[PDB]
Design a protein around this motif. Structure first.
Motif, PDB file in Angstrom:
ATOM      1  N   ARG A  97      44.085  48.070 -10.312  1.00 16.14           N
ATOM      2  CA  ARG A  97      45.001  49.266  -9.577  1.00 16.14           C
ATOM      3  C   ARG A  97      44.472  50.719  -9.708  1.00 16.14           C
ATOM      4  O   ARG A  97      45.277  51.619  -9.638  1.00 16.14           O
ATOM      5  CB  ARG A  97      46.381  49.181 -10.423  1.00 16.14           C
ATOM      6  CG  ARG A  97      46.900  47.753 -10.703  1.00 16.14           C
ATOM      7  CD  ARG A  97      48.440  47.970 -10.669  1.00 16.14           C
ATOM      8  NE  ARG A  97      48.983  48.371  -9.401  1.00 16.14           N
ATOM      9  CZ  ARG A  97      50.442  48.243  -9.130  1.00 16.14           C
ATOM     10  NH1 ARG A  97      50.925  48.078 -10.344  1.00 16.14           N
ATOM     11  NH2 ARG A  97      50.593  48.730  -8.047  1.00 16.14           N
ATOM     12  N   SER A  98      43.073  50.830  -9.405  1.00 13.11           N
ATOM     13  CA  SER A  98      42.510  52.043  -9.161  1.00 13.11           C
ATOM     14  C   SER A  98      41.822  51.960  -7.743  1.00 13.11           C
ATOM     15  O   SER A  98      41.161  51.250  -7.230  1.00 13.11           O
ATOM     16  CB  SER A  98      41.251  52.115 -10.193  1.00 13.11           C
ATOM     17  OG  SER A  98      41.597  51.532 -11.809  1.00 13.11           O
ATOM     18  N   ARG A  99      42.095  53.424  -7.459  1.00 11.13           N
ATOM     19  CA  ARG A  99      41.967  53.609  -5.855  1.00 11.13           C
ATOM     20  C   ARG A  99      41.120  54.940  -5.739  1.00 11.13           C
ATOM     21  O   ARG A  99      41.648  55.848  -6.401  1.00 11.13           O
ATOM     22  CB  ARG A  99      43.154  53.425  -4.840  1.00 11.13           C
ATOM     23  CG  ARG A  99      43.623  52.117  -5.033  1.00 11.13           C
ATOM     24  CD  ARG A  99      45.111  51.954  -3.973  1.00 11.13           C
ATOM     25  NE  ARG A  99      44.979  50.739  -3.516  1.00 11.13           N
ATOM     26  CZ  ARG A  99      45.324  49.465  -3.948  1.00 11.13           C
ATOM     27  NH1 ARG A  99      45.339  49.195  -5.036  1.00 11.13           N
ATOM     28  NH2 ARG A  99      45.138  48.312  -3.236  1.00 11.13           N
ATOM     29  N   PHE A 100      40.211  54.875  -4.741  1.00 11.00           N
ATOM     30  CA  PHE A 100      39.390  56.183  -4.361  1.00 11.00           C
ATOM     31  C   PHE A 100      39.369  56.299  -3.146  1.00 11.00           C
ATOM     32  O   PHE A 100      38.705  55.412  -2.656  1.00 11.00           O
ATOM     33  CB  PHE A 100      38.300  56.269  -5.488  1.00 11.00           C
ATOM     34  CG  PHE A 100      38.638  56.044  -6.814  1.00 11.00           C
ATOM     35  CD1 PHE A 100      38.555  54.530  -7.317  1.00 11.00           C
ATOM     36  CD2 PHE A 100      38.678  56.720  -7.708  1.00 11.00           C
ATOM     37  CE1 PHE A 100      38.829  54.334  -8.594  1.00 11.00           C
ATOM     38  CE2 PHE A 100      38.972  56.765  -9.084  1.00 11.00           C
ATOM     39  CZ  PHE A 100      39.014  55.307  -9.766  1.00 11.00           C
ATOM     40  N   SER A 101      39.294  57.546  -2.543  1.00  5.87           N
ATOM     41  CA  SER A 101      38.871  57.966  -1.217  1.00  5.87           C
ATOM     42  C   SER A 101      37.817  58.992  -1.270  1.00  5.87           C
ATOM     43  O   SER A 101      38.185  59.951  -1.628  1.00  5.87           O
ATOM     44  CB  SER A 101      40.120  58.107  -0.594  1.00  5.87           C
ATOM     45  OG  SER A 101      39.629  58.731   0.789  1.00  5.87           O
TER      46      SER A 101
ATOM     47  N   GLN B 257      40.837  56.100 -19.871  1.00  7.13           N
ATOM     48  CA  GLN B 257      39.913  55.920 -19.036  1.00  7.13           C
ATOM     49  C   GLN B 257      40.369  55.756 -17.544  1.00  7.13           C
ATOM     50  O   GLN B 257      39.756  56.337 -16.718  1.00  7.13           O
ATOM     51  CB  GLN B 257      39.237  54.615 -19.458  1.00  7.13           C
ATOM     52  CG  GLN B 257      38.183  54.236 -20.368  1.00  7.13           C
ATOM     53  CD  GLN B 257      37.755  52.921 -20.842  1.00  7.13           C
ATOM     54  OE1 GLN B 257      37.386  52.730 -21.997  1.00  7.13           O
ATOM     55  NE2 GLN B 257      38.066  52.012 -19.894  1.00  7.13           N
ATOM     56  N   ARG B 261      38.555  58.510 -14.969  1.00  7.40           N
ATOM     57  CA  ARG B 261      38.613  58.174 -13.336  1.00  7.40           C
ATOM     58  C   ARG B 261      39.047  59.167 -12.393  1.00  7.40           C
ATOM     59  O   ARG B 261      38.552  59.571 -11.403  1.00  7.40           O
ATOM     60  CB  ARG B 261      38.772  56.658 -13.087  1.00  7.40           C
ATOM     61  CG  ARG B 261      37.688  55.745 -13.976  1.00  7.40           C
ATOM     62  CD  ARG B 261      38.086  54.132 -13.437  1.00  7.40           C
ATOM     63  NE  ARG B 261      39.275  53.916 -13.589  1.00  7.40           N
ATOM     64  CZ  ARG B 261      39.799  53.246 -14.741  1.00  7.40           C
ATOM     65  NH1 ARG B 261      38.982  52.962 -15.667  1.00  7.40           N
ATOM     66  NH2 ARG B 261      41.219  53.008 -14.784  1.00  7.40           N
ATOM     67  N   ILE B 264      37.667  62.452 -11.726  1.00  8.48           N
ATOM     68  CA  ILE B 264      36.436  62.664 -11.111  1.00  8.48           C
ATOM     69  C   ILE B 264      36.513  63.427  -9.673  1.00  8.48           C
ATOM     70  O   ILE B 264      35.844  63.889  -9.279  1.00  8.48           O
ATOM     71  CB  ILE B 264      35.835  61.205 -10.767  1.00  8.48           C
ATOM     72  CG1 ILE B 264      34.999  60.498 -12.156  1.00  8.48           C
ATOM     73  CG2 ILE B 264      34.475  61.479  -9.656  1.00  8.48           C
ATOM     74  CD1 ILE B 264      34.841  59.166 -12.366  1.00  8.48           C
ATOM     75  N   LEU B 265      37.649  62.897  -9.211  1.00  4.62           N
ATOM     76  CA  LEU B 265      38.252  63.573  -7.948  1.00  4.62           C
ATOM     77  C   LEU B 265      39.141  64.489  -7.898  1.00  4.62           C
ATOM     78  O   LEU B 265      40.056  65.033  -7.026  1.00  4.62           O
ATOM     79  CB  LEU B 265      38.634  62.233  -6.804  1.00  4.62           C
ATOM     80  CG  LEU B 265      37.575  61.491  -6.677  1.00  4.62           C
ATOM     81  CD1 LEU B 265      37.940  60.431  -5.733  1.00  4.62           C
ATOM     82  CD2 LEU B 265      36.352  61.941  -6.045  1.00  4.62           C
ATOM     83  N   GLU B 293      40.425  61.621  -2.990  1.00  4.75           N
ATOM     84  CA  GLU B 293      41.669  61.057  -3.557  1.00  4.75           C
ATOM     85  C   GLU B 293      41.530  59.904  -4.561  1.00  4.75           C
ATOM     86  O   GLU B 293      40.779  59.027  -4.207  1.00  4.75           O
ATOM     87  CB  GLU B 293      42.908  60.796  -2.747  1.00  4.75           C
ATOM     88  CG  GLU B 293      43.216  61.877  -1.866  1.00  4.75           C
ATOM     89  CD  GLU B 293      44.373  61.141  -0.813  1.00  4.75           C
ATOM     90  OE1 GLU B 293      45.249  61.086  -1.069  1.00  4.75           O
ATOM     91  OE2 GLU B 293      43.799  60.970   0.315  1.00  4.75           O
ATOM     92  N   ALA B 294      42.020  60.121  -5.829  1.00  2.00           N
ATOM     93  CA  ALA B 294      42.151  59.193  -6.856  1.00  2.00           C
ATOM     94  C   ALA B 294      43.527  58.546  -7.170  1.00  2.00           C
ATOM     95  O   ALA B 294      44.538  59.563  -7.149  1.00  2.00           O
ATOM     96  CB  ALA B 294      41.312  59.538  -8.231  1.00  2.00           C
ATOM     97  N   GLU B 295      43.912  57.383  -7.411  1.00  2.00           N
ATOM     98  CA  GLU B 295      44.987  57.031  -7.886  1.00  2.00           C
ATOM     99  C   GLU B 295      44.936  55.793  -8.970  1.00  2.00           C
ATOM    100  O   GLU B 295      44.363  54.703  -8.430  1.00  2.00           O
ATOM    101  CB  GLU B 295      45.809  56.394  -6.425  1.00  2.00           C
ATOM    102  CG  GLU B 295      47.010  55.843  -6.898  1.00  2.00           C
ATOM    103  CD  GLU B 295      47.816  55.057  -5.632  1.00  2.00           C
ATOM    104  OE1 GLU B 295      48.053  55.640  -4.691  1.00  2.00           O
ATOM    105  OE2 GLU B 295      47.989  54.067  -6.040  1.00  2.00           O
ATOM    106  N   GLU B 296      45.616  55.984  -9.981  1.00  3.52           N
ATOM    107  CA  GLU B 296      45.591  54.964 -10.999  1.00  3.52           C
ATOM    108  C   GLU B 296      47.016  54.678 -11.293  1.00  3.52           C
ATOM    109  O   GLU B 296      47.941  55.416 -11.337  1.00  3.52           O
ATOM    110  CB  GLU B 296      45.060  55.648 -12.302  1.00  3.52           C
ATOM    111  CG  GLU B 296      43.491  56.036 -12.013  1.00  3.52           C
ATOM    112  CD  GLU B 296      42.596  54.998 -12.343  1.00  3.52           C
ATOM    113  OE1 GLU B 296      43.060  53.611 -12.681  1.00  3.52           O
ATOM    114  OE2 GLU B 296      41.431  55.289 -11.771  1.00  3.52           O
ATOM    115  N   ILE B 297      47.279  53.369 -11.208  1.00  2.00           N
ATOM    116  CA  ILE B 297      48.634  52.810 -12.032  1.00  2.00           C
ATOM    117  C   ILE B 297      48.458  52.049 -12.986  1.00  2.00           C
ATOM    118  O   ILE B 297      47.521  51.049 -13.141  1.00  2.00           O
ATOM    119  CB  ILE B 297      49.173  52.132 -10.653  1.00  2.00           C
ATOM    120  CG1 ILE B 297      49.465  53.044  -9.573  1.00  2.00           C
ATOM    121  CG2 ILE B 297      50.548  51.222 -11.188  1.00  2.00           C
ATOM    122  CD1 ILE B 297      49.941  52.154  -8.160  1.00  2.00           C
TER     123      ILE B 297
END
Ligand SMILES: O=C(O)[C@@H]1CCCc2c1[nH]c1ccc(Cl)cc21
Ligand SMILES: [Ca+2]
Ligand SMILES: [Ca+2]
Ligand SMILES: [Ca+2]
Ligand SMILES: [Ca+2]
Ligand SMILES: [Ca+2]
Ligand SMILES: [Cl-]
Ligand SMILES: [Cl-]
Lengths: 360, 356
Positions: A97-101, B257, B261, B264-265, B293-297
């Motif tokens: 569930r980690s996403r990056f653009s 963590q 992550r 970083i953005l 863009e970063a997204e963590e759930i």
């Protein structure tokens, strides 16, 4: 462009293509014929790493920020699956569930080194090139206006490869036989290229293939290919600097010698680092002093039977040598108070180091 | 002045104690003891070494780094003979001989004499805990000078440290089993570093004495003394959210963590990230001027109302790194108020981060 790859199949390649205009801050990524290729470059040298793609993939190419991409992959958990796909001007990276653009720049804009022909080639074990570079690297110049010293000479002669390094004050040379008949030839590899070459060598069972052109050098080991420009200049002749007949051999344990010098150095001149040696039958005495009139003296048992003499030299340079040797016993090859000293592992002539005399 | 001592007995002491004379150590042989003193006029360290071999009284001053480097440089089990001759201090061991310059002991500066007002004893491990729990939240070079150091407060039977830079805060309280007066002193950052450095990790207890303008710590054969910092340190009680009744719990390393992550953005200067809390979920997002863009759930334990809030992610990571624990509790108020963070298993430290 699309691929899915285990984290740890990317990290070593990423480490290798990364560095120590903004597109030079990106990595070129290419999916083709079942392979992901990654390339980094600073225009002087280039590293290409290949990774086999065992999972479904789609071809194409882009460039992405090297540091951010590496850091994302490294930040993901051990064993993670990393799915990458190009989406317009962005590269998408997903894992769990980690996403990056990430922003991209066009693959078309990634610079290439000029094409060139290989004129001399040889293969040798990685361990052998590692020993050659490590033996001499510390004696290369840093940013001297004499641009041709900011690097390492690579010399082929007979069946031997040799490296030479000097900063114009002290000299290191290492020679090793590699079991192949070679032309007599020499080139200068830029200091950064030496360092990058060195870090490519994992000390493993993959053979190293070297190819040298008139203005470039290439090194191939397993999935990695390194290419660098050469320094276009004349290296000084190592041969004229070596003492002609150093007929007074002192031998002593490396660590004892090193520790005695490191203690003496504490009270030597901070800028010029001169220490004096007094050699007598099976005995060495080292002295140092400084502008504050502080004084150090070390006396050691050594092996020596020559005429008595004294010689001064730069203790920083001598300590650099003793730390490079990492061996049991050292040989110091002496002539007189006005001549250089040659130093070697007592049990191997493959590496030799020359340090100038100082009148103290 | 003459002594002969084992290398092993000089090294730790020399390391602990290590305008020109401030670069020197004061050496004193008196009553069968070698004293080694180092100072920068703000603080001072003194080590005492018993002398079991013949020795002669006297005092001098010698370059600290050089003497330390010579002693360290000598081999395991060296015996180190020292005598004043001149003008010079001679150090001999084996066939290694050294002559060092001196400055007169008469010139070595003294901290002014002062009186102890508050005293207590506590385990080394407790002081380590107090300092490591908070040190990272001190300001560096703030014009409010008292924020560059650390508050040490006594209250009831508790010793407490507080550290803050205006943007985030750390507090830690530990019981020490003695009736203490209510008092607060501010120890300068340098003193806090030295105070930590003198522990050591053995089972020697720490004895602390506090004066109106000084603090002193005794452990083993070492005495450290520092001046204090004047000024009015903020009240941690007013910084703690009054009622942060939205309680989120998550694994500490998982949470760290994920933030690391996302970071970083985040903007390189401002470091902002957004948190979206909802039933048993946390979403962390970040973006930067390049529109990356970063997204963590993450799955978390949360059953309060939904809300979102912005934070400097370096501040949050600092907290999570300073917690050495299994699970963390984040205690929230609203989108425009601070967050309080603790180890889910202990209330003895708490952290406050202002929202962005
Ligand atoms: O800014 C202020 O005037 C005071 C004093 C310094 C510390 C601090 C304040 N107000 C704060 C609010 C939150 C935190 Cl974490 C720390 C502080
Ligand atoms: Ca490169
Ligand atoms: Ca051969
Ligand atoms: Ca093998
Ligand atoms: Ca001497
Ligand atoms: Ca953001
Ligand atoms: Cl003694
Ligand atoms: Cl508390």
């Amino acid at each position: 462009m699309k691929f899915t790859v285990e984290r740890e199949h990317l990290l070593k390649p990423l480490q290798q293509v990364s560095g120590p205009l903004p597109i030079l801050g990106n990595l070129l990524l290419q999916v083709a014929d079942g392979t992901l290729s990654l390339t980094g470059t600073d225009l002087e040298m280039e590293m290409v790493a290949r990774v086999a793609l065992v999972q479904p993939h789609e071809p194409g190419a882009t460039t992405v920020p090297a540091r951010k991409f590496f850091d994302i992959c490294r930040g993901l958990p051990e064993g993670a699956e990393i799915a990458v796909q190009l989406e317009g001007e962005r590269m998408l990276v997903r894992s769990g569930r980690s996403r990056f653009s990430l922003s991209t720049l066009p693959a078309a804009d990634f610079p290439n080194l000029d094409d060139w022909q290989s004129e001399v080639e040889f293969t040798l074990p990685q361990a052998t090139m590692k020993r050659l570079i490590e033996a001499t690297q510390f004696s290369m110049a840093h940013q001297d206006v004499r641009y041709y010293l900011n690097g390492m000479l690579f010399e082929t002669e007979g069946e031997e490869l040799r490296t030479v390094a000097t900063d114009g004050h002290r000299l290191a040379v290492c020679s090793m036989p590699i079991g192949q008949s070679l032309p007599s030839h020499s080139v200068i590899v830029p200091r950064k290229g030496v360092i990058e070459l060195m870090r490519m060598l994992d000390g493993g069972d993959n053979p190293l293939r070297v190819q040298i052109g008139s203005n470039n050098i290439r090194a191939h080991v397993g999935d990695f290919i390194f290419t660098s420009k050469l320094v276009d200049g004349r290296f000084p002749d190592y041969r004229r600097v070596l003492p002609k007949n150093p007929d007074k051999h002192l031998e002593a344990g490396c660590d004892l010698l090193k520790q005695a010098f490191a203690r003496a150095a504490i009270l030597s001149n901070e800028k010029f680092r001169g220490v004096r040696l007094y050699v007598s039958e099976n005995q060495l005495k080292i002295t140092a002093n400084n502008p504050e009139q502080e004084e150090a003296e070390e006396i050691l048992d050594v092996t020596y039977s020559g005429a008595e003499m004294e010689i001064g030299f730069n203790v920083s340079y001598v300590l650099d040598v003793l730390n490079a040797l990492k061996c049991e016993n050292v040989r110091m090859m002496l002539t007189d108070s006005v001549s250089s000293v040659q130093i070697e592992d007592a049990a191997s002539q493959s590496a030799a180091y020359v340090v100038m005399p100082m009148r103290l």
